[PDB]
């Protein structure tokens, strides 16, 4: 950024935690966690 | 009344006779094997 003179280079973030992990299902204005089958490996009877 | 009241016998109908009946039948089970081990994963419908 760039206002007056000054710049401030904002950065990073000292860890790299996310809540939200690599597989993520978003439903009715919620995100869950869960490990969802890829396309294609969709068993019978859960998600997929 | 008084004397000797039994007079006659009547028949009882819609009695309690064999036939067949559809019951249903599950979803198909999935089978995992693994030595001297099956798994089984059940999805029912209605209570089995």
Known sequence: ?48 | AAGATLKGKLHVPFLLADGKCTVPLAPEPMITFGFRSVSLKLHPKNPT
């Open chain 1, 1 to 48: 950024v760039n206002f007056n003179g000054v710049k401030i280079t904002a950065g990073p973030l000292s860890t790299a935690w996310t809540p939200f992990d690599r597989k993520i299902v978003q439903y009715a204005g919620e995100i869950y966690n869960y490990d969802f089958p890829e396309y294609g490996a969709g068993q019978p009877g859960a998600f997929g």
